[PDB]
């Protein structure tokens, strides 16, 4: 009967014999919280989630004909004279991750898209850039020369916190008359930008458009660091000004849902196109998009202390409440559920509030 | 109690273990003196048709509703050229029995006139629809235990053996307090080998058609009858009594058995006359419930197999009165299966599975068109269907565990949808279950065949059953359908008094 | 699911259910091998009864804006044991895999 | 699978339906594990046993 009662929901940590925790908690409470919930607006403060376990990205595989479960919707190019190289895509190799998970099966006629197994998760920038590298390198080698010159590579600074692009340096700078060039799949682009990039006509049949430009044009010279310094400097560097965390993320939302509290049922949006429609109805408690920018680390943890004003959900029937049930999920486009997982070292904590309707509303 | 949105009224009850007080009475149970029984032997049986006539003693003796007819027989099979093979005893332990139910399956029609007004039921195919329908285990295992009466549940015998629920096995091998399989019913074998076999016995079958009853409870037996004469007429084919399994017959389609003949010795029929007490007298004229089955059948040219679907159109009809109940099962055709016995003896008694049905009662179409097959089963069970969802719509994945054969599929049984018109179709207002007028139906429907073994040409059905009242007075037999008027039916003083379910029982 | 009665004063029958087409694949564990004979066996492996209900953490329905929910996971296998008779077991219930664990 | 929570019913007896409804709506949340659908024999293991 009192005007307002708070409740605390925390979930500890429970691994399987196989190390994994379901971030759900559910509990029958040994004695009713609200005497009669017809006159309460339920709302939530202070909820918090360990995000330490989520991929940085789930890289996307081309939906076929494509029978290697592995190579993706990515590519690169080199030019010289200008003889081109047919784009080599990029092959997301398992053993840089895993290596110990079963791989799925590439899908002729039937359904064409490979469903996402925890197998595709990639954490770090250290792990993905190191993949473009094996591609550019492997690309370049079809079109040799002149003389000796390493193919370019991507590296990500810690605290930069910005990805870079290193390339020689007395060729292939774009101001020289004989320059070698880089191109992409225009899809892969989103991560790399904003390097300095001349645009070329979007999605052309033969691979190659967008043109990462080396030439400086800068307070931009760079060297080493694997030999004693030398004049002129070793290679040009073109770090992106913007620094993004970003386009990169696989986290597109998170969603606490609770199938117990008398509540009211609001619909979540789909990623389907055709159609929209079609309002669905299930209770939805609290849920937020990633707040840009909380700056990495935000990969470390999400947090939502309420800042006002009270945001109310409703409550309906007249059953004294006996159960706190709560589920947490993180979603990616294309919009699949993936119930969140709590890492060995952290505890997952919501809070709750009931207010007596009469104080708030006439 | 007056604690609800609308106040409700209270009463108290006492827990079973203590009343301990309420008025007791002593209930003496009066039944007329001199119950008797007598076997009336058939005045002029034959091989083609046989028929009994009996007259109740007088105006005041009440005959009882449960009648049955026992018939002694012999048979003889003889191994044909050129199958053999020709090894082992011509009958085998797991493979042979009578069809459930044996003489019922052969009757072309059974006619029985009462007191001078003739009521008859066709029986060859109408009997199997009614067979699965209303019985439960405890009543299946009572009266209906005399005819070899276990329903054929596989789509062909061939696969059955040897499952401990196989439809024609030996007594041992059938679980404890259950429905025992067809093979168990006794008759003596005078001889058996290869090249010959000969059996003799006596098979009971209780005459099916209403008024006479086959379900356990008793309703007042017909009186005051003046005279009563049954008479059957059987299908010439007659080879249908015996049923035989497939496996034993060899490949090249050759059949061990063919051919054989049957014999009957004069058969009888047992009536039970009861006569009332000195002081309690029976009213001059009385009134019994009077049911009436009918069958409409439509066959087509097209064929489907071994498991492809089809849709079909039943012929249009005009119905004099809305009937109480209807049955709509489509079964392997009658055109075939009277030609060429080995097949005729062999074929089981299952029908094709219903993928769905679309029905039109008068002036509406599309009734039930979006209801998934699963729904039909539920209403049918509600009417008493009694078979599990697995067999309805039957098929089963029984899987092999050997490297590396494929894994057998079994064709199982059949589905037979039933609807009650008030319960299920919904009759327009001013109209109800008994009323008269002219309402045309035409039931389109889609079906798949399931047994893996043979191609099938299918003939659809619709059994309807009207409910009337028939008055007997000696000697008269007025009978009338829909008693029953449109204005009276509309006015309809309604009693929150009688339950539905008690109503359910005096079927049907 | 979210489904509103078609029309005004339309009474609603009380047997409700849900059909759900599925797909499953089994994979062998590279220990103890072999491992001779097909993974699925003849009288060894089949559905848990009743399947969907057992793997439901909880189901909710709200009749007319007032919420009613049950706890399907643990409640069931005990609530299923009675009050069942053979008649009823063989009827409505039969659709879902229906036999107990003896 | 049958919906198992009263008022709705699973025993074969029939009783009045709920007029006068405006909007019914259900919601199924699946238990996380999903292996629990299958059963097995401890025998086939065998002797190690994984």
PDB file of N, CA, C and O in Angstrom, chain B residues 4 17 43 64 66 68 98 127 149 174 245 263-264 296 333 339 372 421 443 461-462 477-479 484 488 496 501:
ATOM      1  N   UNK B   4     -17.690 -10.657  -5.855  1.00  0.00           N
ATOM      2  CA  UNK B   4     -17.386 -10.636  -7.279  1.00  0.00           C
ATOM      3  C   UNK B   4     -17.938  -9.383  -7.933  1.00  0.00           C
ATOM      4  O   UNK B   4     -18.614  -8.585  -7.291  1.00  0.00           O
ATOM      5  N   UNK B  17     -16.440 -38.006   3.018  1.00  0.00           N
ATOM      6  CA  UNK B  17     -16.264 -38.851   4.180  1.00  0.00           C
ATOM      7  C   UNK B  17     -17.189 -38.490   5.310  1.00  0.00           C
ATOM      8  O   UNK B  17     -17.165 -39.147   6.350  1.00  0.00           O
ATOM      9  N   UNK B  43     -36.182 -69.976 -40.573  1.00  0.00           N
ATOM     10  CA  UNK B  43     -37.128 -70.548 -41.510  1.00  0.00           C
ATOM     11  C   UNK B  43     -36.614 -70.294 -42.917  1.00  0.00           C
ATOM     12  O   UNK B  43     -36.733 -69.183 -43.441  1.00  0.00           O
ATOM     13  N   UNK B  64     -36.815 -57.416 -25.853  1.00  0.00           N
ATOM     14  CA  UNK B  64     -35.697 -56.530 -25.518  1.00  0.00           C
ATOM     15  C   UNK B  64     -34.895 -56.123 -26.758  1.00  0.00           C
ATOM     16  O   UNK B  64     -34.870 -56.850 -27.752  1.00  0.00           O
ATOM     17  N   UNK B  66     -31.504 -55.612 -27.390  1.00  0.00           N
ATOM     18  CA  UNK B  66     -30.286 -56.316 -27.798  1.00  0.00           C
ATOM     19  C   UNK B  66     -30.586 -57.675 -28.464  1.00  0.00           C
ATOM     20  O   UNK B  66     -30.949 -58.636 -27.772  1.00  0.00           O
ATOM     21  N   UNK B  68     -29.079 -60.702 -31.362  1.00  0.00           N
ATOM     22  CA  UNK B  68     -27.910 -61.137 -32.131  1.00  0.00           C
ATOM     23  C   UNK B  68     -28.166 -62.438 -32.817  1.00  0.00           C
ATOM     24  O   UNK B  68     -29.055 -63.167 -32.432  1.00  0.00           O
ATOM     25  N   UNK B  98     -10.422 -63.654 -39.271  1.00  0.00           N
ATOM     26  CA  UNK B  98     -11.656 -63.152 -39.884  1.00  0.00           C
ATOM     27  C   UNK B  98     -11.583 -61.635 -39.969  1.00  0.00           C
ATOM     28  O   UNK B  98     -10.923 -61.018 -39.149  1.00  0.00           O
ATOM     29  N   UNK B 127     -21.069 -50.047 -42.140  1.00  0.00           N
ATOM     30  CA  UNK B 127     -20.664 -50.618 -40.854  1.00  0.00           C
ATOM     31  C   UNK B 127     -19.283 -50.153 -40.357  1.00  0.00           C
ATOM     32  O   UNK B 127     -19.064 -50.056 -39.152  1.00  0.00           O
ATOM     33  N   UNK B 149     -13.623 -58.313 -33.324  1.00  0.00           N
ATOM     34  CA  UNK B 149     -13.842 -56.885 -33.541  1.00  0.00           C
ATOM     35  C   UNK B 149     -12.687 -55.950 -33.139  1.00  0.00           C
ATOM     36  O   UNK B 149     -12.850 -55.061 -32.293  1.00  0.00           O
ATOM     37  N   UNK B 174      -0.809 -60.539 -26.856  1.00  0.00           N
ATOM     38  CA  UNK B 174      -1.640 -59.351 -26.743  1.00  0.00           C
ATOM     39  C   UNK B 174      -1.657 -58.908 -25.300  1.00  0.00           C
ATOM     40  O   UNK B 174      -1.993 -59.686 -24.421  1.00  0.00           O
ATOM     41  N   UNK B 245      -2.622 -62.220 -44.851  1.00  0.00           N
ATOM     42  CA  UNK B 245      -1.472 -61.299 -44.940  1.00  0.00           C
ATOM     43  C   UNK B 245      -0.698 -61.407 -46.252  1.00  0.00           C
ATOM     44  O   UNK B 245      -0.818 -62.385 -46.983  1.00  0.00           O
ATOM     45  N   UNK B 263     -19.082 -72.570 -46.380  1.00  0.00           N
ATOM     46  CA  UNK B 263     -20.341 -73.253 -46.161  1.00  0.00           C
ATOM     47  C   UNK B 263     -20.989 -72.756 -44.883  1.00  0.00           C
ATOM     48  O   UNK B 263     -20.312 -72.320 -43.954  1.00  0.00           O
ATOM     49  N   UNK B 264     -22.309 -72.829 -44.839  1.00  0.00           N
ATOM     50  CA  UNK B 264     -23.050 -72.430 -43.666  1.00  0.00           C
ATOM     51  C   UNK B 264     -24.009 -73.555 -43.344  1.00  0.00           C
ATOM     52  O   UNK B 264     -24.485 -74.240 -44.238  1.00  0.00           O
ATOM     53  N   UNK B 296     -24.423 -42.087 -49.525  1.00  0.00           N
ATOM     54  CA  UNK B 296     -24.281 -41.541 -50.874  1.00  0.00           C
ATOM     55  C   UNK B 296     -22.853 -41.724 -51.348  1.00  0.00           C
ATOM     56  O   UNK B 296     -21.930 -41.381 -50.636  1.00  0.00           O
ATOM     57  N   UNK B 333     -11.592 -47.675 -53.539  1.00  0.00           N
ATOM     58  CA  UNK B 333     -12.879 -47.954 -54.207  1.00  0.00           C
ATOM     59  C   UNK B 333     -13.406 -49.392 -54.131  1.00  0.00           C
ATOM     60  O   UNK B 333     -12.645 -50.346 -53.985  1.00  0.00           O
ATOM     61  N   UNK B 339     -12.863 -57.748 -57.821  1.00  0.00           N
ATOM     62  CA  UNK B 339     -12.333 -58.450 -58.968  1.00  0.00           C
ATOM     63  C   UNK B 339     -11.050 -59.145 -58.568  1.00  0.00           C
ATOM     64  O   UNK B 339     -10.187 -58.535 -57.935  1.00  0.00           O
ATOM     65  N   UNK B 372      -7.045 -26.399 -40.362  1.00  0.00           N
ATOM     66  CA  UNK B 372      -6.014 -27.395 -40.663  1.00  0.00           C
ATOM     67  C   UNK B 372      -6.469 -28.790 -40.262  1.00  0.00           C
ATOM     68  O   UNK B 372      -7.192 -28.938 -39.280  1.00  0.00           O
ATOM     69  N   UNK B 421     -24.247 -31.065 -37.159  1.00  0.00           N
ATOM     70  CA  UNK B 421     -24.658 -29.818 -37.810  1.00  0.00           C
ATOM     71  C   UNK B 421     -24.919 -28.625 -36.878  1.00  0.00           C
ATOM     72  O   UNK B 421     -24.530 -27.493 -37.197  1.00  0.00           O
ATOM     73  N   UNK B 443     -19.628 -31.443 -50.982  1.00  0.00           N
ATOM     74  CA  UNK B 443     -18.377 -31.389 -50.232  1.00  0.00           C
ATOM     75  C   UNK B 443     -17.109 -31.630 -51.060  1.00  0.00           C
ATOM     76  O   UNK B 443     -16.663 -32.771 -51.185  1.00  0.00           O
ATOM     77  N   UNK B 461     -17.285 -40.753 -49.722  1.00  0.00           N
ATOM     78  CA  UNK B 461     -18.576 -41.092 -49.136  1.00  0.00           C
ATOM     79  C   UNK B 461     -19.182 -39.928 -48.374  1.00  0.00           C
ATOM     80  O   UNK B 461     -18.558 -38.885 -48.226  1.00  0.00           O
ATOM     81  N   UNK B 462     -20.425 -40.115 -47.939  1.00  0.00           N
ATOM     82  CA  UNK B 462     -21.084 -39.257 -46.967  1.00  0.00           C
ATOM     83  C   UNK B 462     -22.192 -40.114 -46.380  1.00  0.00           C
ATOM     84  O   UNK B 462     -23.114 -40.512 -47.095  1.00  0.00           O
ATOM     85  N   UNK B 477     -47.200 -48.696 -37.232  1.00  0.00           N
ATOM     86  CA  UNK B 477     -45.844 -48.199 -37.058  1.00  0.00           C
ATOM     87  C   UNK B 477     -45.664 -46.832 -37.702  1.00  0.00           C
ATOM     88  O   UNK B 477     -44.916 -46.694 -38.665  1.00  0.00           O
ATOM     89  N   UNK B 478     -46.338 -45.819 -37.174  1.00  0.00           N
ATOM     90  CA  UNK B 478     -46.181 -44.477 -37.713  1.00  0.00           C
ATOM     91  C   UNK B 478     -44.766 -44.001 -37.428  1.00  0.00           C
ATOM     92  O   UNK B 478     -44.226 -44.279 -36.360  1.00  0.00           O
ATOM     93  N   UNK B 479     -44.158 -43.288 -38.371  1.00  0.00           N
ATOM     94  CA  UNK B 479     -42.826 -42.751 -38.111  1.00  0.00           C
ATOM     95  C   UNK B 479     -42.736 -41.409 -38.790  1.00  0.00           C
ATOM     96  O   UNK B 479     -43.255 -41.257 -39.885  1.00  0.00           O
ATOM     97  N   UNK B 484     -41.444 -30.754 -34.336  1.00  0.00           N
ATOM     98  CA  UNK B 484     -40.594 -30.101 -35.339  1.00  0.00           C
ATOM     99  C   UNK B 484     -41.421 -29.217 -36.278  1.00  0.00           C
ATOM    100  O   UNK B 484     -42.027 -29.701 -37.234  1.00  0.00           O
ATOM    101  N   UNK B 488     -42.651 -23.171 -33.817  1.00  0.00           N
ATOM    102  CA  UNK B 488     -42.506 -23.768 -32.514  1.00  0.00           C
ATOM    103  C   UNK B 488     -41.035 -23.856 -32.179  1.00  0.00           C
ATOM    104  O   UNK B 488     -40.640 -23.565 -31.063  1.00  0.00           O
ATOM    105  N   UNK B 496     -32.325 -24.369 -18.653  1.00  0.00           N
ATOM    106  CA  UNK B 496     -30.995 -24.454 -18.096  1.00  0.00           C
ATOM    107  C   UNK B 496     -30.997 -25.683 -17.263  1.00  0.00           C
ATOM    108  O   UNK B 496     -30.181 -25.818 -16.357  1.00  0.00           O
ATOM    109  N   UNK B 501     -24.371 -33.363 -22.037  1.00  0.00           N
ATOM    110  CA  UNK B 501     -23.703 -34.651 -22.146  1.00  0.00           C
ATOM    111  C   UNK B 501     -24.620 -35.849 -21.964  1.00  0.00           C
ATOM    112  O   UNK B 501     -24.496 -36.841 -22.670  1.00  0.00           O
TER     113      UNK B 501
END
